[PDB]
Ligand binder design. Structure first.
Ligand SMILES: OC[C@H]1O[C@@H](O)[C@H](O)[C@@H](O)[C@@H]1O
Ligand SMILES: OC[C@H]1O[C@@H](O)[C@H](O)[C@@H](O)[C@@H]1O
Lengths: 391, 391
């Protein structure tokens, strides 16, 4: 239940920042900096920094963290570095990480070890398909990894108008306490919210009320780190979600909308454990699985990279998630009879019309609306503005 | 710990055999039959048969078996089937497995699930390199897997003159008991034994005696399931090991020589867990790691597929191996100062000369002998007969 943040104390920051100007420095990428944000805020509690070699091995082979207890940790959080930089910095026991001209953190007692890229991609993604857009970034990175104790100077801000939504796990716990929450149920997502998603979240709220929880709180938690090129961008998704809440499709008085700062791997059942354990750190006792969670189509062939039931099955078997209950995904679809979203029943297959993201883009392209009741009208209007902005 | 064998009771065999002639049958390969042998003898205790879907997933993602407790199980033991055979047998709750005209086992309450071959190879081997000889067998197998409860009619014999060495875990425990063993230390291997290997085993015996064990027993345990084309064949290796024992380089009075019936995957750190946990089932309290354990050169390039320290590091971190102590590998080499083998010390680098398997084959090719003290003379003569037999 403890959260291990990695920030310098407030009262020491001005002095610490002043001194770090003298240390040798290592330039990191934007993706690396998003991982520094993830580490800094305690999402990967109790990691002390970028993973050392033994931590990396245990994650890759067992999906658990080096610890006297059992802690779920299924994805590597590692910092790739060039051979040149390894040569320069090995044996330096205290150096700075910098990005965009700013010194953002100090890495202490660093160790350098081989980045065996093909093995990492095979074991984490279950493929080494070079066209996968996140695998491509790993394959292009340096041949070494550096792990160590990380101390982060201050909260990583992006200054894009969305930092107000980038809450830390501690801040989310404080917000839930202010709402007198006695159940926190989380929904991970990377797409617009339609009324089938909403139906799932409303069904979960209803089920928790019937169990006797007095104040269940929905944590609507869109991912906002690196995503692939064909996802709707984060700022447009936040506008769309805001429209859903303003329409009352989800109730603002029992919902927290916040951005989860992690890069997305699109690693299917390996990554859904990460999506779950991070919401657990933020206090969620309940986790709603999505459709094809963390999945994507195999490039070139367009067939599903992962088997669509494996995320839920693996999450149900995973070690170190004892404090969270998995809420199964339930297919919803537009019911032509009720003119409304409803849970799908194969015993009534012919009543239901499915609407995918490609369908929505094609609908906007012809200036069409989806069926009435598929999406809150102001939220649909946000999406048509997005597609229009693509000209 | 209990061993869960899968054999039909003695008193029932003649009856069950007579009945199984009427059941629908599924033809399995030689490799499959070697896995039936592994399963039947309890090496994969407490597996009940070929892995069901949820067992398979937990193995691939977590290296542990579906459990009430935590049990190490890092490799899939699965039965591939063609789509035609799946169509024929799904819903059949009791059918036989057959090979070479013999009905060898009954599979009960079978379930069929997709063989996602690329994902299996990526997660288990950390590569999908097609040319890896065991990966090629997986890639060429059927598109379905079948799991279920397996009942094996009788001990799988190969009738090649080596069945006397293929002892079950129960038989190994009984043999150790007959020797009044109070420590059993196991050495996995797939190659000839030279006097560096022997030095490691003799040093381990010495250390166990100094800890106060009165009767430590060496389990010299060559693997004898499927191996790749360029390994010395099993019958030649057993002749070579017998020569080492007859020369007294290892003491027959405190050594058990037996054949471990598992196919070899050559999957490095994933497979060394399997090599260790199987010896644990047979009662080994101590497990000596070899050099580059379960490794092989990447085909085409010929560099090491795995990082040579990872097998020992991963084994030290693995869950479910609490009752085994890992004895670290120590490099030995031919010391030119004296002439015996000796543990390598970089501080005396120039005294030592290494002798690989390629070096031994080239030595035989020119009719040359290795240095005096590298290998027992009778055992070297076995190897020169082997190399000569390939003309
Ligand atoms: O998810 C945050 C951002 O990540 C970038 O990698 C994507 O290209 C953007 O569209 C997205 O808004
Ligand atoms: O290890 C048992 C046998 O397996 C076969 O696959 C190899 O080709 C033989 O050389 C070996 O003796």
């Amino acid at each position: 239940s403890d959260i291990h943040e990695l920030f310098v104390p407030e009262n020491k920051l001005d002095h610490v920042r002043a001194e770090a100007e003298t240390l040798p420095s290592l330039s990191i990428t934007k993706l690396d900096l998003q991982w520094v944000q993830v580490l800094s805020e305690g999402w990967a509690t109790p990691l002390k920094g970028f993973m050392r070699e033994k931590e990396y091995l245990q994650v890759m082979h067992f999906d658990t963290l080096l610890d006297d207890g059992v802690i779920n940790m299924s994805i590597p959080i590692v910092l790739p570095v060039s051979a040149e930089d390894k040569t320069r910095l090995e044996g330096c026991s205290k150096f700075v990480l910098a990005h965009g001209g700013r010194r953002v953190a100090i890495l202490r007692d660093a160790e350098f070890y081989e980045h065996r890229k093909e093995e990492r991609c095979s074991r984490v993604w279950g493929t080494t398909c070079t066209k996968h857009p996140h695998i491509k970034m790993v394959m292009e990175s340096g041949d070494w990894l550096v792990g160590g104790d990380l101390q982060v100077l201050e909260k990583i801000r992006w200054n894009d108008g969305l930092d107000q939504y980038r809450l830390t796990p501690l801040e989310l716990k404080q917000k839930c306490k202010e709402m007198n929450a006695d159940a926190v149920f989380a929904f991970q997502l990377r797409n617009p919210v339609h009324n089938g998603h909403a139906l799932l979240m409303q069904d979960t709220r209803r089920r928790l009320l019937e169990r006797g929880y007095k104040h269940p709180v929905l944590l609507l938690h869109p991912l906002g780190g690196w995503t692939k090129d064909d996802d709707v961008p984060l700022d447009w998704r936040m506008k769309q979600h805001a429209a859903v809440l303003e329409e009352g499709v989800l109730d603002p008085k029992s919902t927290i909308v916040a951005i989860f700062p992690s890069p997305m791997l699109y690693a299917g059942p390996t990554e859904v454990q990460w999506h779950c354990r991070s919401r657990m750190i933020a206090g969620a006792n309940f986790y709603i699985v999505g459709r094809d969670p963390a999945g994507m189509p195999h490039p070139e062939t367009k067939k599903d990279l992962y088997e669509p039931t494996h995320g839920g099955k693996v999450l149900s078997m995973a070690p170190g998630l004892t404090s969270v209950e998995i809420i199964p995904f339930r297919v919803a679809a537009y019911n032509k009879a009720k003119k409304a979203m409803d849970f799908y029943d194969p015993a009534r297959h012919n009543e239901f019309d499915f609407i995918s993201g490609t369908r929505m883009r094609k609908l906007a392209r012809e200036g069409e609306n989806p069926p009435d009741g598929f999406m809150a009208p102001k939220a649909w209007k946000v999406l048509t503005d997005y597609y229009r902005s693509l000209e």
